Amino acid sequence: STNDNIKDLLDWYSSGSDTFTNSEVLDNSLGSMRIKNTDGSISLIIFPSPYYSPAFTKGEKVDLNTKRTKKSQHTSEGTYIHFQISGVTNTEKLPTPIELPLKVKVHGKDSPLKYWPKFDKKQLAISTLDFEIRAQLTQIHGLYRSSDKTGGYWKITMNDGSTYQSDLSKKFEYNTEKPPINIDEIKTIEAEIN
């Protein structure tokens, strides 16, 4: 028996993500962007953070690794629109797709990984890393599905000593999100469940 906030977390992190590559910027206002995907849909993405306010200009190409905030819509004008939050990075690729060094501990015990993917984009938003990591945990390790797996944290340590961490008992802090990072510079990723 989990409390309600954990149930909300279980629904958010087990609902997948939206991936679009080489999309085009149509407009860039404060706190948002309007983007046209190669399939013909439009994405309206919000950016609630002052530290990560995309500065792309009309016509520039960008990748999308985002989460939808709600059901897409078929407009009268005949367009298909997605409503998403964060997750826009440059289209720059890595030579060879790398596997991110994630180590997981569930109550101190080392929990081995299953279906943990490789990444080939040189840059990933911190919120994207947040949901990839938390999806591995909810799907493979039982996070949020029971009272004994409702807290903990994940921590990324960069080659230079910089770290990023997130508390597993709360949804990701989008309002304070930092700029995307070069995944090739990540030294390690730790995650512990309690």
Side-chain angles (χ1 to χ4, degrees), residues 168-184:
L168 298 181
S169 58
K170 317 198 188 71
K171 198 186 289 185
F172 182 79
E173 287 185 48
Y174 287 101
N175 66 317
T176 58
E177 186 182 7
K178 271 57 195 191
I181 69 196
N182 292 333
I183 70 174
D184 58 296

PDB file of all heavy atoms in Angstrom, residues 168-184:
ATOM      1  N   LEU A 168      14.498  10.335  -5.508  1.00  0.00           N
ATOM      2  CA  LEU A 168      13.503   9.419  -6.074  1.00  0.00           C
ATOM      3  C   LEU A 168      12.098   9.503  -5.490  1.00  0.00           C
ATOM      4  O   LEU A 168      11.148   8.983  -6.080  1.00  0.00           O
ATOM      5  CB  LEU A 168      14.001   7.978  -6.024  1.00  0.00           C
ATOM      6  CG  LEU A 168      15.258   7.657  -6.823  1.00  0.00           C
ATOM      7  CD1 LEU A 168      15.610   6.180  -6.683  1.00  0.00           C
ATOM      8  CD2 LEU A 168      15.050   8.005  -8.272  1.00  0.00           C
ATOM      9  N   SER A 169      11.943  10.154  -4.345  1.00  0.00           N
ATOM     10  CA  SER A 169      10.613  10.264  -3.753  1.00  0.00           C
ATOM     11  C   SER A 169       9.778  11.421  -4.281  1.00  0.00           C
ATOM     12  O   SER A 169       8.657  11.625  -3.811  1.00  0.00           O
ATOM     13  CB  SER A 169      10.688  10.330  -2.228  1.00  0.00           C
ATOM     14  OG  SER A 169      11.479  11.417  -1.783  1.00  0.00           O
ATOM     15  N   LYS A 170      10.314  12.192  -5.226  1.00  0.00           N
ATOM     16  CA  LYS A 170       9.574  13.322  -5.786  1.00  0.00           C
ATOM     17  C   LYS A 170       9.735  13.347  -7.297  1.00  0.00           C
ATOM     18  O   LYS A 170      10.681  12.789  -7.817  1.00  0.00           O
ATOM     19  CB  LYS A 170      10.097  14.653  -5.237  1.00  0.00           C
ATOM     20  CG  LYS A 170      10.380  14.699  -3.754  1.00  0.00           C
ATOM     21  CD  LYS A 170      10.450  16.151  -3.281  1.00  0.00           C
ATOM     22  CE  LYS A 170      10.915  16.278  -1.834  1.00  0.00           C
ATOM     23  NZ  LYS A 170      12.359  15.940  -1.677  1.00  0.00           N
ATOM     24  N   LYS A 171       8.813  13.968  -8.015  1.00  0.00           N
ATOM     25  CA  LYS A 171       8.994  14.060  -9.457  1.00  0.00           C
ATOM     26  C   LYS A 171      10.213  14.958  -9.706  1.00  0.00           C
ATOM     27  O   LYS A 171      10.592  15.737  -8.834  1.00  0.00           O
ATOM     28  CB  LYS A 171       7.770  14.662 -10.146  1.00  0.00           C
ATOM     29  CG  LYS A 171       7.780  14.354 -11.651  1.00  0.00           C
ATOM     30  CD  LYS A 171       6.665  15.052 -12.406  1.00  0.00           C
ATOM     31  CE  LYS A 171       5.296  14.462 -12.090  1.00  0.00           C
ATOM     32  NZ  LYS A 171       4.228  15.094 -12.946  1.00  0.00           N
ATOM     33  N   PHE A 172      10.826  14.837 -10.881  1.00  0.00           N
ATOM     34  CA  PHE A 172      11.994  15.627 -11.251  1.00  0.00           C
ATOM     35  C   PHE A 172      11.708  17.131 -11.151  1.00  0.00           C
ATOM     36  O   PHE A 172      10.583  17.577 -11.409  1.00  0.00           O
ATOM     37  CB  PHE A 172      12.412  15.245 -12.670  1.00  0.00           C
ATOM     38  CG  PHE A 172      13.641  15.946 -13.159  1.00  0.00           C
ATOM     39  CD1 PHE A 172      14.895  15.529 -12.762  1.00  0.00           C
ATOM     40  CD2 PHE A 172      13.540  17.011 -14.045  1.00  0.00           C
ATOM     41  CE1 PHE A 172      16.031  16.159 -13.231  1.00  0.00           C
ATOM     42  CE2 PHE A 172      14.664  17.642 -14.511  1.00  0.00           C
ATOM     43  CZ  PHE A 172      15.913  17.217 -14.107  1.00  0.00           C
ATOM     44  N   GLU A 173      12.698  17.898 -10.702  1.00  0.00           N
ATOM     45  CA  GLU A 173      12.554  19.347 -10.598  1.00  0.00           C
ATOM     46  C   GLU A 173      12.848  20.060 -11.910  1.00  0.00           C
ATOM     47  O   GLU A 173      13.975  20.481 -12.176  1.00  0.00           O
ATOM     48  CB  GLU A 173      13.417  19.888  -9.485  1.00  0.00           C
ATOM     49  CG  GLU A 173      12.815  19.517  -8.140  1.00  0.00           C
ATOM     50  CD  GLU A 173      13.536  20.113  -6.944  1.00  0.00           C
ATOM     51  OE1 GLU A 173      13.819  21.344  -6.964  1.00  0.00           O
ATOM     52  OE2 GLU A 173      13.787  19.342  -5.977  1.00  0.00           O
ATOM     53  N   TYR A 174      11.816  20.168 -12.739  1.00  0.00           N
ATOM     54  CA  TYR A 174      11.907  20.807 -14.048  1.00  0.00           C
ATOM     55  C   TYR A 174      12.189  22.301 -13.933  1.00  0.00           C
ATOM     56  O   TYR A 174      12.995  22.851 -14.686  1.00  0.00           O
ATOM     57  CB  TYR A 174      10.611  20.569 -14.842  1.00  0.00           C
ATOM     58  CG  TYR A 174      10.445  19.147 -15.363  1.00  0.00           C
ATOM     59  CD1 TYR A 174       9.615  18.229 -14.707  1.00  0.00           C
ATOM     60  CD2 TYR A 174      11.108  18.717 -16.523  1.00  0.00           C
ATOM     61  CE1 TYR A 174       9.450  16.921 -15.194  1.00  0.00           C
ATOM     62  CE2 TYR A 174      10.945  17.414 -17.018  1.00  0.00           C
ATOM     63  CZ  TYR A 174      10.119  16.524 -16.349  1.00  0.00           C
ATOM     64  OH  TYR A 174       9.947  15.231 -16.819  1.00  0.00           O
ATOM     65  N   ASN A 175      11.548  22.940 -12.958  1.00  0.00           N
ATOM     66  CA  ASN A 175      11.698  24.380 -12.729  1.00  0.00           C
ATOM     67  C   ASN A 175      13.130  24.808 -12.412  1.00  0.00           C
ATOM     68  O   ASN A 175      13.471  25.972 -12.575  1.00  0.00           O
ATOM     69  CB  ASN A 175      10.737  24.867 -11.634  1.00  0.00           C
ATOM     70  CG  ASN A 175      11.072  24.291 -10.269  1.00  0.00           C
ATOM     71  OD1 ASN A 175      11.367  23.095 -10.144  1.00  0.00           O
ATOM     72  ND2 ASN A 175      11.054  25.134  -9.241  1.00  0.00           N
ATOM     73  N   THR A 176      13.976  23.871 -11.999  1.00  0.00           N
ATOM     74  CA  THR A 176      15.368  24.200 -11.685  1.00  0.00           C
ATOM     75  C   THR A 176      16.346  23.447 -12.559  1.00  0.00           C
ATOM     76  O   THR A 176      17.540  23.410 -12.269  1.00  0.00           O
ATOM     77  CB  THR A 176      15.737  23.876 -10.214  1.00  0.00           C
ATOM     78  OG1 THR A 176      15.513  22.484  -9.948  1.00  0.00           O
ATOM     79  CG2 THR A 176      14.921  24.710  -9.249  1.00  0.00           C
ATOM     80  N   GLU A 177      15.852  22.858 -13.637  1.00  0.00           N
ATOM     81  CA  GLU A 177      16.714  22.090 -14.496  1.00  0.00           C
ATOM     82  C   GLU A 177      17.855  22.866 -15.126  1.00  0.00           C
ATOM     83  O   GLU A 177      17.698  24.020 -15.555  1.00  0.00           O
ATOM     84  CB  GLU A 177      15.912  21.359 -15.554  1.00  0.00           C
ATOM     85  CG  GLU A 177      16.754  20.407 -16.412  1.00  0.00           C
ATOM     86  CD  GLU A 177      15.940  19.720 -17.489  1.00  0.00           C
ATOM     87  OE1 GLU A 177      14.746  20.061 -17.684  1.00  0.00           O
ATOM     88  OE2 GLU A 177      16.507  18.825 -18.151  1.00  0.00           O
ATOM     89  N   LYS A 178      19.006  22.201 -15.141  1.00  0.00           N
ATOM     90  CA  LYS A 178      20.256  22.684 -15.697  1.00  0.00           C
ATOM     91  C   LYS A 178      20.363  22.308 -17.173  1.00  0.00           C
ATOM     92  O   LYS A 178      19.673  21.419 -17.665  1.00  0.00           O
ATOM     93  CB  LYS A 178      21.439  22.091 -14.918  1.00  0.00           C
ATOM     94  CG  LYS A 178      21.858  22.940 -13.732  1.00  0.00           C
ATOM     95  CD  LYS A 178      20.683  23.140 -12.793  1.00  0.00           C
ATOM     96  CE  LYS A 178      20.916  24.255 -11.776  1.00  0.00           C
ATOM     97  NZ  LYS A 178      19.867  24.240 -10.704  1.00  0.00           N
ATOM     98  N   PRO A 179      21.257  22.970 -17.897  1.00  0.00           N
ATOM     99  CA  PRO A 179      21.425  22.689 -19.321  1.00  0.00           C
ATOM    100  C   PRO A 179      21.765  21.234 -19.585  1.00  0.00           C
ATOM    101  O   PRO A 179      22.281  20.549 -18.701  1.00  0.00           O
ATOM    102  CB  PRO A 179      22.597  23.591 -19.706  1.00  0.00           C
ATOM    103  CG  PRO A 179      22.546  24.697 -18.702  1.00  0.00           C
ATOM    104  CD  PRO A 179      22.213  24.000 -17.433  1.00  0.00           C
ATOM    105  N   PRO A 180      21.426  20.727 -20.786  1.00  0.00           N
ATOM    106  CA  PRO A 180      21.727  19.344 -21.148  1.00  0.00           C
ATOM    107  C   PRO A 180      23.242  19.106 -20.982  1.00  0.00           C
ATOM    108  O   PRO A 180      24.015  20.060 -20.831  1.00  0.00           O
ATOM    109  CB  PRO A 180      21.332  19.305 -22.603  1.00  0.00           C
ATOM    110  CG  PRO A 180      20.168  20.220 -22.646  1.00  0.00           C
ATOM    111  CD  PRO A 180      20.661  21.389 -21.861  1.00  0.00           C
ATOM    112  N   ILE A 181      23.681  17.852 -20.993  1.00  0.00           N
ATOM    113  CA  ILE A 181      25.102  17.569 -20.818  1.00  0.00           C
ATOM    114  C   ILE A 181      25.628  16.577 -21.848  1.00  0.00           C
ATOM    115  O   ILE A 181      24.858  15.871 -22.506  1.00  0.00           O
ATOM    116  CB  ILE A 181      25.417  16.991 -19.412  1.00  0.00           C
ATOM    117  CG1 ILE A 181      24.835  15.582 -19.269  1.00  0.00           C
ATOM    118  CG2 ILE A 181      24.960  17.935 -18.296  1.00  0.00           C
ATOM    119  CD1 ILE A 181      24.766  15.107 -17.864  1.00  0.00           C
ATOM    120  N   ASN A 182      26.945  16.578 -22.025  1.00  0.00           N
ATOM    121  CA  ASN A 182      27.603  15.670 -22.953  1.00  0.00           C
ATOM    122  C   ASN A 182      27.665  14.322 -22.252  1.00  0.00           C
ATOM    123  O   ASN A 182      28.423  14.153 -21.282  1.00  0.00           O
ATOM    124  CB  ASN A 182      29.026  16.140 -23.245  1.00  0.00           C
ATOM    125  CG  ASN A 182      29.077  17.433 -24.034  1.00  0.00           C
ATOM    126  OD1 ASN A 182      28.161  17.767 -24.789  1.00  0.00           O
ATOM    127  ND2 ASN A 182      30.135  18.193 -23.828  1.00  0.00           N
ATOM    128  N   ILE A 183      26.913  13.346 -22.743  1.00  0.00           N
ATOM    129  CA  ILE A 183      26.922  12.054 -22.081  1.00  0.00           C
ATOM    130  C   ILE A 183      28.273  11.349 -22.129  1.00  0.00           C
ATOM    131  O   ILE A 183      28.580  10.539 -21.263  1.00  0.00           O
ATOM    132  CB  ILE A 183      25.776  11.128 -22.555  1.00  0.00           C
ATOM    133  CG1 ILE A 183      26.011  10.648 -23.990  1.00  0.00           C
ATOM    134  CG2 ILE A 183      24.449  11.853 -22.391  1.00  0.00           C
ATOM    135  CD1 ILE A 183      25.002   9.642 -24.465  1.00  0.00           C
ATOM    136  N   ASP A 184      29.110  11.686 -23.102  1.00  0.00           N
ATOM    137  CA  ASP A 184      30.428  11.055 -23.185  1.00  0.00           C
ATOM    138  C   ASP A 184      31.347  11.490 -22.028  1.00  0.00           C
ATOM    139  O   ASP A 184      32.400  10.892 -21.804  1.00  0.00           O
ATOM    140  CB  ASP A 184      31.094  11.335 -24.543  1.00  0.00           C
ATOM    141  CG  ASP A 184      31.249  12.820 -24.836  1.00  0.00           C
ATOM    142  OD1 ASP A 184      30.207  13.509 -24.959  1.00  0.00           O
ATOM    143  OD2 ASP A 184      32.402  13.294 -24.959  1.00  0.00           O
TER     144      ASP A 184
END
